[PDB]
Design a protein around this ligand. Sequence first.
Ligand SMILES: *[C@H]1O[C@H](CO)[C@@H](O[C@@H]2O[C@H](CO)[C@@H](O[C@@H]3O[C@H](CO)[C@@H](O)[C@H](O)[C@H]3O)[C@H](O)[C@H]2O)[C@H](O)[C@H]1F
Ligand SMILES: [Ca+2]
Ligand SMILES: [Ca+2]
Ligand SMILES: [Ca+2]
Ligand SMILES: [Ca+2]
Ligand SMILES: [Ca+2]
Length: 302
Amino acid sequence: SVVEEHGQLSISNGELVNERGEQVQLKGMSSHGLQWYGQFVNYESMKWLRDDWGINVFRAAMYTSSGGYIDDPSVKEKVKEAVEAAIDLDIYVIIDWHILSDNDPNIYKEEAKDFFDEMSELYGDYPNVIYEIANEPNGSDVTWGNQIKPYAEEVIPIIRNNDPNNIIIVGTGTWSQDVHHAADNQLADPNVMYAFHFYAGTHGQNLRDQVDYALDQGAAIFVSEWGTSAATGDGGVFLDEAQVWIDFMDERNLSWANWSLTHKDESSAALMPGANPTGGWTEAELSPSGTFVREKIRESAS
Ligand SMILES: *[C@H]1O[C@H](CO)[C@@H](O[C@@H]2O[C@H](CO)[C@@H](O[C@@H]3O[C@H](CO)[C@@H](O)[C@H](O)[C@H]3O)[C@H](O)[C@H]2O)[C@H](O)[C@H]1F
Ligand SMILES: [Ca+2]
Ligand SMILES: [Ca+2]
Ligand SMILES: [Ca+2]
Ligand SMILES: [Ca+2]
Ligand SMILES: [Ca+2]
């Protein structure tokens, strides 16, 4: 029903809108690395998230490094499973080329182009797909002007050859925080959004102001990763500040995906160790983070 209702998404003056030009705000979950916690990504768990949490988007985090796609491309099978489940469930899905330790997107540019050509050839005709071409550029030697923009200018045409209109999310500097630099030197493609990532135990007002600067430049922003913990994904749970961030995003209608759907023993994890991989979770199987995020999505669902 989500995709049936909104259909083809597009950007209109920095806003994510549906095929009728109305605002759309996606709220969902991101998987953790598919090479480690892929069992939590399947039709049943996605259906449970759709039906019990109210998600309207699912993010498949395909790490490139750290035992991911570069070393073992079989993980692509999990990405396809996720996309196919999202199509069957009628929700949106983000295919995330999840760079991190490989901090410059240009490290695996050829492989990225090849992967996105394949993904866009396979799924380019479905409105469900959103491509996220470089999770988190990072490092002092990696900037928008020198590394990220040019990378995007090479990958985007590859996708556009097969899929002229689906949304493309592009990572920004300093672990997808530097949306101000991107907003001052935007890509030409009309259907792009810049990623902004935050952790409630580490980031606050200064970064909210930075996002506002970017929005004031007409840039579209997708919060494709955010956590209730510290920036490491652990170090405690900060729901007071997480709610400040939630309100901030609602005021601005920013779409988001929470990190992350896993049973790993880290504060940002949504599930407790041993949680059922196919869903149907008891309240006891959700962590404090998970309980809170589920409420945030339910309280705005339908
Ligand atoms: C956005 O931020 C989050 C939070 O920092 C990042 O997610 C964290 O990524 C860590 C690095 O991949 C990950 O730790 C790794 O976990 C693996 C699976 O258990 C371990 O094998 C590995 O030793 C360890 O470094 C955190 O668990 C995870 O929250 C996310 O990648 C960024 F995009
Ligand atoms: Ca099955
Ligand atoms: Ca091709
Ligand atoms: Ca398309
Ligand atoms: Ca080039
Ligand atoms: Ca709204």
